[PDB]
RNA sequence: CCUUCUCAAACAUUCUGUUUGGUAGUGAGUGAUACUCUUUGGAGUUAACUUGAAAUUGCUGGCCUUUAGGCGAACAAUGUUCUUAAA
């Protein structure tokens, strides 16, 4: 989870302040005009809207999905492990939607999809996928089927 | 005096910093009225290489946009040679209160036609120029407390000095 | 404590880099000093001067005794400091960081500067800066009245000074400033005499505001300090008149 | 394969249009001077500090 | 309905970069980053030519 | 010197050798190997007692890179030109600035890469080896040249095309585009690379027989060989195809007396 | 059943037996530690072997490291079965070159040159396409 | 959880030329044609290919120094010991 956060902090989305700042820069450029060039590769960032996260699945586009364990309407979330299971998407259940919101400039996020990666980071991506599929899909798959809890307090 | 002081652990800075900031802003605007009232520019410019010689009041150049007798322009047209031995700071400021010049060899080794007087406190004086007057610095401390000239035989090294009791 | 798995690797890699650049420095300087310049990069040495992307001007080295003031920097990220550089910093008393000292620059002095370059910062000092350092900081280890005597005293008594420096006839710590600036008769007397220097950390740190200062200063230090590891590394010099405005 | 045979939109491949409309909004505001350029703003602050 | 100055200048850049042909300017990356439609290019260029430059 | 006639004899012998003949659609790499000339030099102590990844650029009368490129258009692997430049260098130099200079003499830089790009984009052995294996011509600034071998990988220093070539944009304090402009011309068409391994064996790669004229091969070989004789004390010279056995042309028997 | 001897694959660069000892001592005391190295240059072959005082401590150490991401690529550790022993590893250094003199004098090997040249000419006959030299 | 030698000199003015020096590697595996000695111990060189930094034990070069270091540096040499990246 630590290296996953080190990954996703490389792919923080742009804040509203940074967005508006770049907008003012390019707008002052065109205001002088001083139309510098027409070139920008793409923005790459994490994807965090829940319907947008589900939307990036069923294409498939999600290379990694982080799923928060704690959501108070849990039923918003419960299909996502089975859905990434059947779609073959490398999902991982992360601990705490606040830590998702921190990496995406929200209060909470509860989902975290990531699709587009630079070539500098693509090799780290694949080994992280293999790491998760070793650590999550192998360890917890059979005990996922078992009825948890039931022991009194 | 500009000496490294052992810091006291007993004090708390949290009060003296408030006094500091209050006095800083207050003296700041009072320096504004004293610089504008004296008719010159409130930001004082300094040559950087003059500051590299010495970090003092003499670093600042003071722009444009009589003296009260006798203490102002006491020792008029008067050229000093303060040594490297003497404390440069308060003697420098006293000569600037006189209007005379300051020549220290301590400033010189960073890198003497009109010099008549050495302020020095040393037992053995090397070059012993009879043209140049050899004086222990209390002469400046006593002349300005009197406002007037006194003989320098007591202030000649290594003659003993009158126990100075200031006018208070 | 269970330390970690990663720090032990990163320290090993960083010590590998440092031992490699130090061996390169040692071999290249041995070929220079033995004067067997056959197949090396360059014969003569260079000096960087960072002033205000900011302007970085180089000079050739002049074989002239130059007064330098050295300032110990916290070394790079996870590095065990090697025993060769540990020896030099032990001689120059630069352990317990934020600790400078005044030094003489000659051509016998110069090769160690390429060695300990990733741990200190160098430049040309000014008389006002030297003056401020000595009039505001400095303690002398001292044999006193009746002591167990690991005993250090701040610079107040010029008569304590001319006591132990009467043989060279050195009085009045202003003259110690003057002869460190001068180095005409004896610098090294004053150099062994003023033996410890201590500088405060520039930012107090722990607390909400000062972490911003720490991050901005780490970014500034990343812009300023450059780590060549080439063994023909130009000696980086910075404005100690700018630096002591921060640290003193 | 995915579920839906939804055709890919044009705007996923080209630089974002709505960004550019917001850009031209700011351009029209600066042409009217309602927004000061940030270099001019730093120029203002550097004089106003003194 | 006239044309805007930036985009007619953009068309003017395309008119000098490729000339008149459309299959080359359609597969141009620089100055066709919105990847305009084959014939929208024709329509805007014909409007620009009728406006300016025959 | 060296009897040019004997070299024409040997190259006509090799033309006759390569003229000797369920099959593949796409032809064997080994079939492409058995058509190519390699110069082999026996010489006393070709070590500098140290590894030499620096390539010597020998002045050659003819330029095989143009028939390389013309057959490479037909070939599967396409001839590509890589330059590796400084960060400020790439900030200043643009691509049309290169392309306008190179269309004058009719060549082309494929790509230009910063050391930053080597150390973050291709900081992965698979992607780096795949990126290097695309290229035939690899150029690098002489300042960067001695910083390369941690970034390049030793798999790049194994082969002759994959190892980079020293080239200089500077002539004064700063670089000039004129210097890089004519310097890529010098390195392109007037110079040939030389690996400098250890031992007594030197292998020099010349190229496929189908690319050049055989007397032009002979002229280039004799020029290079005289350059080598004036350079180094040489035991012998065997030139051959790497499928073929050797061909003794020239040797100096007294070099071995002069070693000890 | 499993022994205390341990196989570790996929080691990072510069990560050696000293660091293996210094790290895996925190699991418990270890019996032996070795790294597969290359012969000409003493570089890691990225796999090695551990031995502990206990098999149970070996299994505990193997559990918390089997899918462990570390310094780039992940690591994989497997304990060995009870029938397993350590064999044949050595810390190889960089083997520098040696130069030894030629034993034969210069005129014997001049004769050897003259013989080998004629012999290669006979091979160019024997292969064989014509070569008058 | 770190980041990799990102230039030196000489000559020359040609609006920049000419010469010289400066580079230890990712491990494993395939494999052409050979070359050189060594005194059989092989050693050092030579095309070409593969591979998600992959991964299972190739048994103990030599010489020199000190109690580990150099052979790409011989009165050559080296250690894991920097705290406001804390708690």
CSV table of C-alpha atoms in Angstrom, one decimal, chain A residues 1 5 7 11 24 45 48-49 56 58 60 63 89 99 104 116 125 135 137 144 146 148 153:
chain,number,residue,atom,x,y,z
A,1,UNK,CA,0.0,0.0,0.0
A,5,UNK,CA,0.6,5.5,-2.7
A,7,UNK,CA,2.8,5.5,-7.3
A,11,UNK,CA,-0.1,10.8,-10.7
A,24,UNK,CA,-4.3,32.4,-16.5
A,45,UNK,CA,-4.0,11.5,-13.6
A,48,UNK,CA,-11.8,9.0,-9.0
A,49,UNK,CA,-15.5,9.6,-9.9
A,56,UNK,CA,-13.6,3.0,-17.1
A,58,UNK,CA,-16.5,-2.3,-19.1
A,60,UNK,CA,-11.8,-2.1,-20.1
A,63,UNK,CA,-5.2,-0.8,-15.2
A,89,UNK,CA,-9.2,-5.9,-13.9
A,99,UNK,CA,-6.4,8.4,2.0
A,104,UNK,CA,-7.2,13.2,-5.3
A,116,UNK,CA,-2.8,6.1,-18.5
A,125,UNK,CA,3.0,-0.5,-13.1
A,135,UNK,CA,-0.4,-10.5,-2.5
A,137,UNK,CA,-5.6,-12.6,-5.4
A,144,UNK,CA,-13.2,-14.4,0.6
A,146,UNK,CA,-16.2,-17.8,3.8
A,148,UNK,CA,-16.9,-13.8,8.3
A,153,UNK,CA,-18.3,-9.8,21.8
